[PDB]
Amino acid sequence: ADKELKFLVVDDFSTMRRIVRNLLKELGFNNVEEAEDGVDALNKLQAGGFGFIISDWNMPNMDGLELLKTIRADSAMSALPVLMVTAEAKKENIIAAAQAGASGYVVKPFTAATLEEKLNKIFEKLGM
């Protein structure tokens, strides 16, 4: 996948956003912007050019699942890759992510190596 792919990292916790942004940088992905919830995310997505979303599951105003469904049902970004992050792997949340079209699913905290594995699985599936 292109090194200049523009990521949006979504989480209401600034530290986690920084951590994910830093892991992305570690993998060579420098084009990264942040959003603090689903609403803020959708607002920033309007600037256009975004090629990948990483979103936390629980956020105020609009959570991760709500954001994911909105993106998937949106005319312009329905095919955007979306990696969902949760605090715990549960059958219910995994199946909820599957039904909504999550491109990937990962439990935090995760290493750069894990992030890389998840991104690569998504790139492969999408032919990126």
């Binding site: 059958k91 995994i94 199946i95 992510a97 999550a102 699985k121």
Partner: peptide, 13 residues
């Protein structure tokens, strides 16, 4: 874990 790990694999996650 078993089903979780299997479920994940099945979904390609």
């Amino acid at each position: 874990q078993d089903q979780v790990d299997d479920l994940l694999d099945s979904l390609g996650f």
